UniProtKB/Swiss-Prot annotation, chains A, B:
In absence of cGAMP, the transmembrane and cytoplasmic regions interact to form an integrated, domain-swapped dimeric assembly. In absence of cyclic nucleotide (c-di-GMP or cGAMP), the protein is autoinhibited by an intramolecular interaction between the cyclic dinucleotide-binding domain (CBD) and the C-terminal tail (CTT). Following cGAMP-binding, the cyclic dinucleotide-binding domain (CBD) is closed, leading to a 180 degrees rotation of the CBD domain relative to the transmembrane domain. The pLxIS motif constitutes an IRF3-binding motif: following phosphorylation by TBK1, the phosphorylated pLxIS motif of STING1 recruits IRF3. IRF3 is then phosphorylated and activated by TBK1 to induce type-I interferons and other cytokines. This is Stimulator of interferon genes protein. Residues 1-177 are annotated as: Cyclic dinucleotide-binding domain (CBD). There is a cross-link at residue 176 (Glycyl lysine isopeptide (Lys-Gly) (interchain with G-Cter in SUMO)). It comes from Homo sapiens (Human). Changing residue 6 to S/V: Partially constitutively active mutant that promotes the production of type I interferon in absence of cGAMP ligand. The lineage of its organism: Eukaryota, Metazoa, Chordata, Craniata, Vertebrata.
């Protein structure tokens, strides 16, 4: 029916509510320790199309550089379950034009897969509007979450382009203020 | 409305479909390498109550021993995202009566949390039947999944007891055949 609403709240309480409070603290460690990546976490949400696993192939201008400090903790009986993220370099005309923490909204690929299996009661036409609904309920969550306080920026998009440009646009404008 | 159905399918396509095919292979590595833990993955699903993060406190007789070999791979733009599980010793009258890979159905604690936040449209009364629905749709998935082929056993339960006994019951009976 409306699976996206539930998955958005799962994205909050099982991930971002966990890693947002300590995110900025762990970026400082990397930058301070390494000779710079900006503070926010940038989450890609392709609405129409699917979610690749390697951004470098989704857009060659998005080159991955290094990892962050891992985040560990016991969650649901697994001692030292570790949450890790990735830092990507974004190029423009062969020039390093940005650096930041970039990743896809993993639940989006769950939706894409569920629209294939039969007994999920989820048709391939509903896919777009569910991706839209997911992108939006998550927006409502982050505006009034105490954990989200200039922590992350949603990058929604739909493709009939170049992704590296789309993320650059969000980077360039958060530096404006 | 009916959030559990969606979360069950998220549990399959984002976790068990990933780690079940290689699970048994990675258990052999541990046992063969370490001087024994049985092959299945045992997933706890408390329906009424919540999901603690440390089983040793949920039941003192469930003592954690060691970890498995980590499982890594790129998923949604995070290079070398790692999935790890935990191996627990289960005691009986102060005696080591079992060893296996044990964990909670993480989505269950997502449900428990969502029943608190206001704008999730999810009341605290619906909690039990949603946990029931989650336990069941997942059963339907594992019966006809090609990835699940004597890989894991669901341990559902509801508490007005001793958990270590409940898991032992499932261990003792899978050894009967
Ligand atoms: N991008 C990203 N990186 C992460 O490290 C990460 N960890 C969680 N999540 C996303 O947040 C939510 C996690 O909630 P939960 O863990 O309760 O459900 C998860 C979780 O129960 C199960 N799962 C995934 N990894 C593990 C794990 N290491 N241990 C147990 N369960 C896991 O599979 C469900 C769906 O995961 P994803 O569908 O890949 O995206 C998850 C999910 O939407 C992550 N997203």
């Amino acid at each position: 029916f409306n699976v996206a609403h539930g998955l958005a709240w799962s994205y909050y309480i099982g991930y971002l509510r966990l890693i947002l409070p300590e995110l900025q603290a762990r970026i400082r460690t990397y930058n301070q320790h390494y000779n710079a990546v900006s503070q926010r976490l940038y989450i890609l949400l392709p609405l129409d199309c699917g979610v690749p696993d390697n951004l470098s192939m989704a857009d060659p201008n998005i080159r991955f550089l290094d990892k962050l400090p891992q985040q560990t903790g016991d969650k649901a009986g697994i001692k030292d379950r570790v949450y890790s993220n990735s830092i990507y370099e974004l190029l423009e005309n062969g020039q390093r034009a940005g650096t930041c923490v970039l990743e896809y909204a993993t639940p989006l690929q769950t939706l894409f897969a569920m629209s294939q299996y039969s007994q999920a009661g989820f048709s391939r036409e509903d896919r777009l509007e569910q991706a839209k609904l997911f992108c939006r309920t998550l927006e409502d969550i982050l505006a009034d979450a105490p954990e989200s306080q200039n922590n992350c920026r949603l990058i929604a998009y739909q493709e009939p382009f170049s992704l590296s440009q789309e993320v650059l646009r969000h980077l360039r404008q958060e530096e404006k203020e």
